[PDB]
RNA sequence: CGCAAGACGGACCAGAGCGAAAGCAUUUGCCAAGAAUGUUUUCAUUAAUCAAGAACGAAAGUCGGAGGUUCGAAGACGAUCAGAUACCGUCGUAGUUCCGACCAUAAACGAUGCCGACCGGCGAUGCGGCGGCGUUAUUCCCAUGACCCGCCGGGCAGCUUCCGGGAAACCAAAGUCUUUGGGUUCCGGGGGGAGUAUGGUUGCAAAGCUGAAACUUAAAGGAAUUGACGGAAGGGCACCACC
RNA sequence: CCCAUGAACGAGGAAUUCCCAGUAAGUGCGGGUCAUAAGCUUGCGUUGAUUAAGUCCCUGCCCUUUGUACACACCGCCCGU
């Protein structure tokens, strides 16, 4: 005998400085109605954000796990929680005749965020190949693999969370990987295809309003 | 009859053999 | 009930996981997030028959009942979350996805991005039905 | 959405169970480069106007 | 007699392959026995494209495939009529359909 | 959103590789092993096949622990049906997973023992080596990778052929067979009875290996051809079919 | 033949037949039978349409490929208590 929408609050979603299209949208909570606060409810809420949606020209395959780490008031800011790719763009990548190589990097920042990236890898038929197999000897895959690994422990050992996001963006990672390894085999579609995150810090309220500028 | 359940039924006589052939041992 | 954003310009983007098993559709409107809901129907809900509860007109119905509580509660535009069974069983998408899809943006609905979001295992537990298979 | 007239330009084959429908090319002589495929019932030749209650459908080939 | 040369699957140095189980069923069949298709389908057919590409909020939205390996043992995929029976000549052509 | 446990390693994954066979598929490290190629290295007949004897041996099954996610014999229930101790469905114990011991069997198949020689062709592919225009990466060239073009050896195979063989299907081996002899092991002798009885032997057990006879019977069977039939696929026709 | 009596039947359930042009259907008249004789049949005109110019959905038939332990041939063959 009562609408529960009618106790509803709709607060704004605000995207770190790392990103041009500022706002992502629109989520509805219930009002601090007893002992339960809206905020303290409304904090660990994760937006899957197509690239193309928050950066202003980008490929749109690429996603990013936006948790609301902290809300200063009708405004739930938000903070990087891991890369993804669409399984539409990860399933196409995937096709018979060449090798799939993938390795993945339990790493730290400078700061205490813990990622887990996930590179991948196809070797690529050559302009003048007439052979259909166009596979990779298991040397070669886990010498790629060995490169794949030291170049994502050296991308972001050295660097915060802000500027490897600003290097996920782009193809910074995947296209450095890319050229390194056509020494060994050459592979083209060569993406990190996921960012996971595993452990941040005891939150700091300046450190979030530094990524909002 | 099917080469095999023939095999089981052929089985299962020589097990109640050996039960019988048994109680007078 | 009530999106306080502006007039025109901005959309109030949702997101449905449209769930199309072979014997049930489901059409779930959520928020960005996907922790609040704002409208959920079935097939089941809208037939009296157990028969055609995945039956591409009960997908319909379902999608036009949400589309008519969502278009209530502000929400203009919706991203799309397609689901099949999946996990050891089928990963095609079941006869209702398509209705409720085309369904909903008929009833006045924006489409904003599409993609599978089917449980698709690296390899799962041993699937139902023994070795030989479901006979008939 | 109003009721439109079409011109039957081709007509195709014979669909349906029975074979008890003309598929069509029909071209709106509203939008006079507009052009679908469509099934119709009984005797069609070409050139003769079909009333669409709708003309957002658009049947599939022979 | 001997029908197929191959014996109707394609291990020839194994002795063993891994049991897929059939989609359709759930009989468990030799990988290299299994009839495999790989299905890439658009989402919408062609009457829901009309309507998506009208109520998309984008500009000229490619819209996205679904890309599913579907894995069939004989009797499922001769019933749902994916492969079917040949003449003994007609039965060597390895040659995929157009 | 998390958390836990236990299974399993999709897509890549192939008439691809490796292994004596059973079998083997996430990453990284360690431990020993192995084929093939390369060799103007060494020993110098050390070999091939094998009664006895020995190692390994899918799944199921057994005994003692650890674990129990899913699936699931038995079981209970709901359906179908005339009945339905089936097929379908909801649950569901043993089992399925791990360690330690058994077990020793599979359509364990290539239904094709191993070693050796000889006898057409062609395109591929996997591994190693060798040679060759040219593209390409390390750019700063060397030499290595990625391709391309050939050669050699060994490997899984493939296509073609009046080698030749075969009852034929078919087979570069199932050929070199009445023009019959390269070496060697196992094994068959019409169909049943019967892999039964009985004795031995192995096993905790289940069962394994070895293994008859009386009696019974004119066929059982193999390959291929023509028909008929099909609840297999496709094509065609008819107001004694339909619309 | 005459007078008289004046029942059901208010367009037909499941199912099913026949038919595409002078056709269907309506309508009578001949022939066969016939001593007596048409609710039948076989012919003939007369009046004269609806719908369709298609398909393999149903029912049959015929193909081609396929499988077979069938061959007086699926009403076949055949297994166990």
């Known amino acids: 005998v009562v609408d529960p929408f009618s106790k509803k609050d709709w607060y704004d979603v605000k995207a770190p400085a790392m990103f041009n299209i500022r706002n992502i949208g629109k989520t509805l909570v219930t009002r601090t109605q007893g002992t339960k606060i809206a905020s303290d409810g409304l904090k660990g809420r994760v937006f899957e954000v197509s690239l193309a949606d928050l950066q202003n020209d980008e490929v749109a395959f690429r996603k990013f796990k936006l948790i609301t780490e902290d809300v200063q008031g009708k405004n739930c800011l938000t903070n990087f929680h891991g890369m993804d790719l669409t399984r539409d763009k990860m399933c196409s990548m995937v096709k018979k005749w060449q090798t799939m190589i993938e390795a993945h990097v339990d790493v730290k920042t400078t700061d205490g965020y813990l990622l887990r990236l996930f590179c991948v890898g196809f070797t690529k038929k050559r302009n003048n190949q007439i052979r259909k197999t166009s596979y990779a000897q298991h040397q070669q895959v886990r010498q790629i693999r060995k490169k794949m690994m030291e170049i994502m422990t050296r991308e972001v050992q050295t660097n915060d969370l802000k500027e490897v996001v600003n290097k996920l963006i782009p193809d910074s990672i995947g296209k450095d990987i890319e050229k390194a390894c056509q020494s060994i085999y050459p592979l083209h579609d060569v993406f990190v295809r996921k960012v996971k995150m595993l452990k941040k810090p005891k939150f700091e309220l300046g450190k979030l309003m530094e990524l909002h500028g | 009859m099917r080469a095999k359940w023939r095999k089981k039924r052929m089985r299962r006589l020589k097990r109640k053999r050996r039960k019988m052939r048994q109680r007078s041992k | 009930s009530l999106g306080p954003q502006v007039a025109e310009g901005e959309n109030v983007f949702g997101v449905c996981h449209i769930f199309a098993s072979f014997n049930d559709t489901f059409v779930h409107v959520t928020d960005l997030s996907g922790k609040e809901t704002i409208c959920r129907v079935t097939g089941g809900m809208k037939v009296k028959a157990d028969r055609d509860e995945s039956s591409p007109y009960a997908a319909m119905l379902a999608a036009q009942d949400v589309a008519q509580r969502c278009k209530e509660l502000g929400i203009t535009a919706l991203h799309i979350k397609l689901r099949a069974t999946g996990g050891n069983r089928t990963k095609t998408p079941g006869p209702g996805a398509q209705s409720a899809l085309r369904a909903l943006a008929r009833s006045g609905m924006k489409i904003g991005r599409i993609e599978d979001v089917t449980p698709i295992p690296s390899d799962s537990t041993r699937r139902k039905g023994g070795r030989r298979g479901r006979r008939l | ?62 | 007699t001997k029908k197929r040369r191959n014996n109707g699957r394609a291990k020839k140095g194994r002795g063993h392959v891994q049991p897929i189980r059939c989609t359709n069923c759930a009989c468990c069949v030799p990988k290299d026995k299994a009839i495999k298709k790989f299905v890439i389908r658009n989402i919408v057919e062609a009457a829901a494209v009309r309507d998506i590409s009208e109520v998309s909020v984008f500009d000229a939205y490619v819209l996205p495939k679904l890309y599913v390996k579907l894995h069939y043992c004989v009797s499922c995929a001769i019933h749902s009529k994916v492969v079917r029976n040949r003449s003994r000549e007609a039965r060597k052509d390895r040659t995929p359909p157009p």
């Open chain 4, 1 to 62: 959405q109003p009721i439109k007239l079409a011109r039957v330009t081709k007509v195709l084959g014979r669909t349906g169970s029975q074979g008890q429908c003309t598929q069509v090319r029909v071209e709106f002589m509203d939008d006079t480069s507009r052009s679908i495929i469509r099934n119709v019932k009984g005797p069609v030749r070409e050139g003769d106007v079909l009333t669409l209650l709708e003309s957002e459908r658009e049947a599939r080939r022979l």
